[PDB]
Nucleic acid binder design. Structure first.
Ligand code: MG
Ligand code: MG
Ligand code: MG
Ligand code: MG
Ligand code: MG
Ligand code: MG
Ligand code: MG
Ligand code: MG
Ligand code: MG
Ligand code: MG
Ligand code: MG
Ligand code: MG
Ligand code: MG
Ligand code: MG
Ligand code: MG
Ligand code: MG
Ligand code: MG
Ligand code: MG
Ligand code: MG
Ligand code: MG
Ligand code: MG
Ligand code: MG
Ligand code: MG
Ligand code: MG
Ligand code: MG
Ligand code: MG
Ligand code: MG
Ligand code: MG
Ligand code: MG
Ligand code: MG
Ligand code: MG
Ligand code: MG
Ligand code: MG
Ligand code: MG
Ligand code: MG
Ligand code: MG
Ligand code: MG
Ligand code: MG
Ligand code: MG
Ligand code: MG
Ligand code: MG
Lengths: 208, 225, 156
RNA sequence: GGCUCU
RNA sequence: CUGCAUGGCUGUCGUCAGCUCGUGUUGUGAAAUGUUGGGUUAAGUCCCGCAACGAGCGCAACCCUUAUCCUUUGUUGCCAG
RNA sequence: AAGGCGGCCCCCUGGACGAAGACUGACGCUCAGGUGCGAAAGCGUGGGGAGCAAACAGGAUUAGAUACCCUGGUAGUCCACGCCGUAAACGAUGUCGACUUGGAGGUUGUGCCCUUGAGGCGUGGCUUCCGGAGCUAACGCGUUAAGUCGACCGCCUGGGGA
RNA sequence: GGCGUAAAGCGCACGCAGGCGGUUUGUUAAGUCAGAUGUGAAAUCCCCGGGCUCAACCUGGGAACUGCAUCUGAUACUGG
């Protein structure tokens, strides 16, 4: 019960919001429900797709969803086949005309949500958690990260006594505000319970 | 290469008092004058000449030599001798693990080089000038400690030491690594960790200069050979 | 190549303000199938790191042992701190008759026929030190011949 | 100044 | 229902200045050194010294606001002339 | 010898050490049982009795206070002769002998050098501290060994119960 | 195998019996060593073999029974 969320603390400095629109109070919470429902839908559909960051922006009563994903071939299919299928249901949910853009994720090993979900998928298919944490750290420091910290929590190996473990390689300054800390969190629903995964990635300092 | 009355003129026969001496120096002590032991130069000369012969052996095959003295009296003399025979020196404090943890000290050799590159040659002007002074006293410290070996790159092949107890740490690190040791063993020291024992005074500047000049000679002659 | 055996792992502790800190120790021994033997003792928060540190220290600090064909040369004794250790050369194919840690150190030592006995404390660290000291100070007929200044045949 | 137990 | 099967979130000691690692070395070993010493600081802050050399999380700064000034832009704000 | 021994003087008396010589010629070491000595407290008889002080009494303190604190105070402490025969009676290290690097002292002899000053060089006895090898579980001991060996004795064998 | 601190040096000492005993020469030959002889029942154990279809088992021969006694020598050590 101690640490602030590094994204929410970095949101004015080096991190951008995942929703960049403007509205008055009349249509604010309605837009925010619509954004929640579409991020819900896209996560369930693109679960096998290595989606990282769903960015939502709505100008002129027209939603524009920018999906960042490690592979766009399975999300698109043919050019506007599955994307157009998801676009017409996004416009059904949002009630406005939609537009879907796709940003490819270079170096998917340097994206916190993908790493945590890969670990979660491994724990769900019953691998050793320490091997998963090692390979995530070795792969990120190989790919060029200045520092990674992972942390799992609870019911490890089906052990009735829940504990947390964490690995660290490189420097991860959380208190440094200009640090490009990619932080995200996943959950593994094992047969013995819920295993929580947190991941911090330090890319370097933005000199604004 | 140095005669006995040369050693006697420089002051090699002097030593320390009789309440500080090591009983292992009995085969090296001639007598005791004014409550001070006297070093047998009869056994000093042929042992120093055996050491210079082995120095000529290693510098024949281009071995690396490290001069070790941080007595704050022979610091400049051990520097001028190692830059005379372009070998490597330690004039200020022997860092603990300079040899055994070489792979760690190497990362400070590299840091000293990049700081010298950036500031003198690299002209790494225009930073926060207070950090430029923290860089300055950093580079001063690294040159003061690791400047004599910054071009060595690997482990040396022989170590020449001025005092076996003021520098007993370098003896142990060399003794572990199988590196031969040539040392000026005074009366208050231990001649066991030294592979080639040279009796003689340690604080006498004339004797330090005699030893170092005789080594920089038989090294340059062994280098050329 | 160099065969490597861990003898024993052990979990140790260290009590601090927060509570108990656990750690793991590893005792490994290496050898070339001949007289070159060496042991290591590593310690870390985790068991594979401890075996790796132990194998690292064991690959260095090797010691050379003047073996006979496949056995020792004379009945030798070794002590370290709790562990008087007796070992004896034996006939061909009688095996390694030895207890615990001494079996592992002699197996990587390349010995194959001993009659050993560990008296006293059988702590594996001290008994493996006592075996290393016994094999190290075991001397050959050549070394005793050069020492006494006689031939081997004059020694028999 | 002394000032028990858990 | 079980917070004594769990995640997540929060309190707390405590914004206290501390907690550790790698290699090296010492010790049979648990462990130690580093991290100790002299000063100094809000601070394991800095300097010097030293079997340690280095590094990391933290102590700091980078953030916001206030406090003075300048330029730009002057309405729905302003009024010296 | 240990326990232990503290003004000064005398009487009786034991032991140690040193220097040179002279003499005897293995006469020696250890020791079960045995014998003797053996702090304080205690006992007995006879004295003595200032101070201190178990006990005890009173005052306080405290929840209580058969205690610590206070005011008093008896055996006792003292002497002679006997008994007891124990102590963390400890160096918690049996006695005797031999060998093995050093340093700084203390004390007590003694030889020599011109004591050219209270100095200089030695050689014996006893003693303290540090410490090397080596030993030891470690702590530490370390030429006065807990090192390397020999001779003899005493003793130990899980914690209680005991 | 131990006894500074883990159990364990009598509180100290003298000292009988007892255990041990410097060095040299001579003698003895007790101890000791070597050899021989007698004995140490057989079985058993062990070795080399043989026989029951093998083995268990049975069995031939041998070694062994580390001992004791006598005699003959040896004389370094110990003793006298
Ligand atoms: Mg907080
Ligand atoms: Mg035991
Ligand atoms: Mg209590
Ligand atoms: Mg009660
Ligand atoms: Mg809880
Ligand atoms: Mg919880
Ligand atoms: Mg329960
Ligand atoms: Mg370390
Ligand atoms: Mg070690
Ligand atoms: Mg600390
Ligand atoms: Mg520490
Ligand atoms: Mg400090
Ligand atoms: Mg800091
Ligand atoms: Mg801060
Ligand atoms: Mg006579
Ligand atoms: Mg006696
Ligand atoms: Mg008696
Ligand atoms: Mg009395
Ligand atoms: Mg009386
Ligand atoms: Mg009376
Ligand atoms: Mg009275
Ligand atoms: Mg009273
Ligand atoms: Mg008693
Ligand atoms: Mg006493
Ligand atoms: Mg005492
Ligand atoms: Mg006693
Ligand atoms: Mg000492
Ligand atoms: Mg011993
Ligand atoms: Mg002794
Ligand atoms: Mg002892
Ligand atoms: Mg025992
Ligand atoms: Mg006790
Ligand atoms: Mg005891
Ligand atoms: Mg006693
Ligand atoms: Mg005799
Ligand atoms: Mg006879
Ligand atoms: Mg006979
Ligand atoms: Mg028979
Ligand atoms: Mg047959
Ligand atoms: Mg005789
Ligand atoms: Mg005789």
């Amino acid at each position: 019960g101690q640490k602030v969320h590094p994204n929410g603390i970095r949101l004015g400095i080096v991190k951008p919001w995942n929703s960049t629109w403007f509205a008055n109070t009349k249509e604010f919470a309605d837009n925010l429900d619509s954004d929640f429902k579409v991020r819900q839908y896209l996560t369930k559909e693109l679960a096998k797709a290595s989606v990282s960051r769903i960015v939502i922006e709505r100008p002129a009563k027209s939603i524009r969803v920018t999906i960042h994903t490690a592979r766009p071939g399975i999300v698109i299919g043919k050019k506007g086949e599955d994307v157009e299928k998801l676009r017409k249901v996004v416009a059904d949910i949002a009630g406005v005309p939609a537009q879907i853009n796709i940003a490819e994720v270079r170096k998917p090993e340097l994206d916190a949500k993908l790493v945590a979900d890969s670990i979660t998928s491994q724990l769900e298919r019953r691998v050793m958690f320490r091997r998963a944490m090692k390979r995530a750290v070795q792969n990120a420091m190989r790919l060029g990260a200045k520092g990674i910290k992972v942390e799992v929590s609870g019911r490890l190996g089906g052990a009735e006594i829940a504990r947390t473990e964490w690995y660290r390689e490189g420097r991860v300054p959380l208190h440094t505000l200009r640090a490009d800390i990619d932080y995200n969190t996943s959950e593994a629903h094992t047969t013995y319970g819920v295993i929580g995964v947190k991941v911090w990635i330090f890319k370097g300092e933005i000199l604004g | 290469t140095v005669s006995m009355r040369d050693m006697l003129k420089a002051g090699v026969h002097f030593g320390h008092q009789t309440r500080y001496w090591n009983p292992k120096m009995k085969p090296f002590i001639f007598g005791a004058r004014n409550k001070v032991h006297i070093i047998n130069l009869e056994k000093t000369v042929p042992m120093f000449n055996e050491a210079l012969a082995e120095l000529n052996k290693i510098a024949s095959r281009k071995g690396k030599i490290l001069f070790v003295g941080t007595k704050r009296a022979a610091s400049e003399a051990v520097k001028d001798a190692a830059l005379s025979c372009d070998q490597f020196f330690v004039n200020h404090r022997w860092l603990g693990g300079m040899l055994t943890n070489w792979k760690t000290v190497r990362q400070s050799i590299k840091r000293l080089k990049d700081l010298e590159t950036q500031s003198q040659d690299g002209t790494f002007d225009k930073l926060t000038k207070k950090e430029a002074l923290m860089r300055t006293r950093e580079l001063e410290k690294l040159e003061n400690s690791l400047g004599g070996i910054k071009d060595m790159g690997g482990l040396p092949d022989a170590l020449f030491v001025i005092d076996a107890d003021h520098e007993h740490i370098a003896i142990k690190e060399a003794n572990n690594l199988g590196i031969p040791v040539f040392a000026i063993v005074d009366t208050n020291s231990d001649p066991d960790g030294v592979d080639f024992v040279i009796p003689g005074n340690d604080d006498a500047i004339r004797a330090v200069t005699l030893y170092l000049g005789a080594v920089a000679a038989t090294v340059r002659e062994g280098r050329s050979q | 190549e160099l065969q490597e055996k861990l003898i024993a792992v052990n979990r140790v502790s260290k009590t601090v303000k927060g509570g108990r800190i656990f750690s793991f120790t590893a005792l490994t021994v290496v050898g070339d199938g001949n007289g070159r033997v060496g042991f290591g003792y590593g310690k870390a928060r985790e068991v594979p790191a401890a075996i790796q540190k132990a194998m690292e220290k064991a690959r260095r600090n090797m010691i050379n042992v003047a073996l006979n064909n496949g056995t020792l040369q004379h009945p030798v004794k070794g002590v370290h701190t709790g562990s008087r250790v007796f070992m004896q050369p034996a006939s061909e194919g009688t095996g390694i008759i030895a207890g615990g840690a001494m079996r592992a150190v002699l197996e990587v030592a390349g010995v194959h026929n001993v009659l050993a006995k560990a008296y006293g404390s059988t702590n594996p660290i001290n008994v493996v030190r006592a075996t290393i000291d016994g094999l190290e100070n075991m001397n050959s007929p050549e070394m005793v011949a050069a020492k006494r200044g006689k031939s081997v045949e004059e020694i028999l």
